[model samples]
Target: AVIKVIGVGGGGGNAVEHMVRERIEGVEFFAVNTDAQALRKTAVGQTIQIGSLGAGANPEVGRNAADEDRDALRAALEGADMVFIAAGMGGGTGTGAAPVVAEVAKDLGILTVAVVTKPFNFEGKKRMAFAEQGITELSKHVDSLITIPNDKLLKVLGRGISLLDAFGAANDVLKGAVQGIAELITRPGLMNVDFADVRTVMSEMGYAMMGSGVASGEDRAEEAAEMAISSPLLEDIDLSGARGVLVNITAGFDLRLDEFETVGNTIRAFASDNATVVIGTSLDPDMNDELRVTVVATGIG
Candidate 1:
């Protein structure tokens, strides 16, 4: 019943850890963003330990290869219930380390969840691509995912917001969203939905949803979901005995309620009759935002 959150950016990741610690108890918390010492201070109440690896393109390489960080991460995850990979995905740190860590977690039978932030759109297409690819790869290892798209998120303010200011706003939004998902998993009526179920169900719907683009309202959701299964990102995942697919429709405020419903409604429309979906939502109030969805479908592969 304990959840662990790991970060890529030093301060940003730790900030999330502190926030979660203050709000929820009986769960362990840790920050592996910048300082190794800070990572050592993390709390996970089990003897079985796991690790968080680090990999990136450049100056941000504070640690060695992913293997270098593996021993610690492995020790931390052993005999654990859940692990949260929380890092600002910029191709390295969060992006790089998270997938490998989850790989290790799965190797040990520990369920893993990733809470990542996409790079700001202004960072350009390259960064966006990295985040996208990193997430795609990470999903292969993780049982489920919760995302905060920075580029799409920044649009809530439209214009006049400084990048740093936008970062702060994004941080809050990420924190809130992560907290919501974390809370949902631990609450009653949600056990039917676990991280593994999230991975499979979302993979199918995501496959169907992403293809035609997120612009066409409900059809987009349907197509995006079809894309999930049809596309490489989520193709191999299986969705069976799955019940309850909840999507988080918060990606900065400029959100279209109908579009959000479109996404949710579309999933419900095709979801298995035996399965029932519960919907939870939030807003970022920004424009130029992207559609980020999280689904928890229980009883699937």
Candidate 2:
């Protein structure tokens, strides 16, 4: 089974490239766009061009382009067990075509996850409203939707950052979140997370969040768990009521049993009392004195 990651439109093209640049191994990467020129710029090997002259900022046009290439999209994502669609809202191709692509994947019964970015505040009320509409439409098709508002990046990064740098940082954070979940389920680990388990956790309908943290020191386990729980990417989410949670811990081969217990318990403590918490551990000889933890929480925002 393969996990297919597709980037839709210009922003999504950039994002999918960012994920590839992050060196996520053992999966297929793709980019779909109405702009052939923008599609050519992406690092993704698989590119699907939908329109001849682009969508002209009109979402309906973009959606039609995707509809025209529906068969090709289906063929590319045919065997994927999971499909992740990354796009930026408020624009024609991304805001419109992304949902269509997601529906294509979902119709195949493949677990679909949509990672989207909304426009920045200065983009004005119209763009923001357009993004909200896109979000509402996209939410109906995917198994889980992870949205990062461009305006929130301002609050997360605070002042003194250039617009260019701000967007770069947003892309970097998006890469980390996607890569973490990909590695957790795909990479070999001490306590493996079965594909069935991953499918179950991801297939639940609603919003989802992914957070990661790393620590090195005597108390690395607890420290990493704390950091992951308080991750800035999760600033908008309250995991206290999360209905489904998956915690993955990666450390050196010398990892202690006590460390595992502490990390696992600390992660579970943040979830709802009645929630199901699945834990997995991995031992990497390359991770001396360091521990990395990733948490994926779903439902309840």
Candidate 3:
């Protein structure tokens, strides 16, 4: 199956460029932008320019640009079994073009997932409202929509961080999300999670949160599970109300059956009794005594 990640707009393009530089496996990266200068700066090999200049922070202009270039967008996105749309909502292209891109993907019968960022409070109430509208529009066209608020970065990364580093950190979170889902279906696992399982858990599940943790030692499983569920980067939402939970565990050859059970039991305990829980595990020889857990809780507020 072909997996593609398309970054829409300036912020989105930067995120995709970051992922490309990081060299994520089993995925193709594309950057879509209304600004020619911004698109030129991206390191991604495949790029599509939708407008001559830029959207000037106006979503309506961004929307029209995407609408006018629908064919170009389709040509760029075609033949991908799964597509992940990464964008930063609030200004211009991302706020408007992302949903249009999702619509094209949907029409092509692709399994589309979007991981977008909401602007910080300092960006003003107008941007926040625009972000909300963009999110609602994007949600309708994608199978799963996971949103990370920029304000949450302060709690996780602290206020002393440089502006460049802060955005890099946000991009890292988005990269993890796309990579996690791609690995779930593309890689072999002890107990596998196929495309069907992922679709069942994420399809039209609305807002979602993803968190991950890594640990070593005898208590690795429990420790990792707890951290994965409560990672500061994740939005503070109650998991008990979540409709589904997808858990992926990465461990070394020393992993024990009991340890695997412990991880599952811990996460399941935190979710609603009726919620569907899907678990998958992969081995890494280099991990040795370490264990890593990544959890996506779907249908959240």
Best by lDDT: 3
lDDT, candidate 1, at 136: 81
Cα lDDT tens digits for candidate 1, 1-301? 7676656544346446555644542346655544455456644222222233434343234323455677777777676766766667765556666677768777887666666677776777776786787778777877666555665554347677776677776556555545545544553221234655444443323211111122234344455445433432223334434444555443444555566566666666656767656554544334244544544443343
Per-residue lDDT tens digits for candidate 3, residues 219-280, read 99999999888887664778888898989887777878888789999999999999888888
Question: Is 1 or 3 the stronger prediction by TM-score?
Answer: 3
Error of 3 at 137 (Å): 1.1
What's the lDDT for all of these models?
Answer: 0.53, 0.81, 0.87
What would the per-residue lDDT of candidate 2 be over residues 166-258, giving only the tens digit for each residue? 778767767765666666667656677787776777785588877778999889989998998887667778888787787878887877778
TM-score of each: 0.58, 0.92, 0.93
In order of TM-score, best first, we have: 3, 2, 1
User: Which rank order by lDDT, best down to worst?
Assistant: 3, 2, 1
Clashes of 2: 0
The 10 consecutive residues of candidate 2 with the worst lDDT sum are 51-60
Best by TM-score, which number? 3
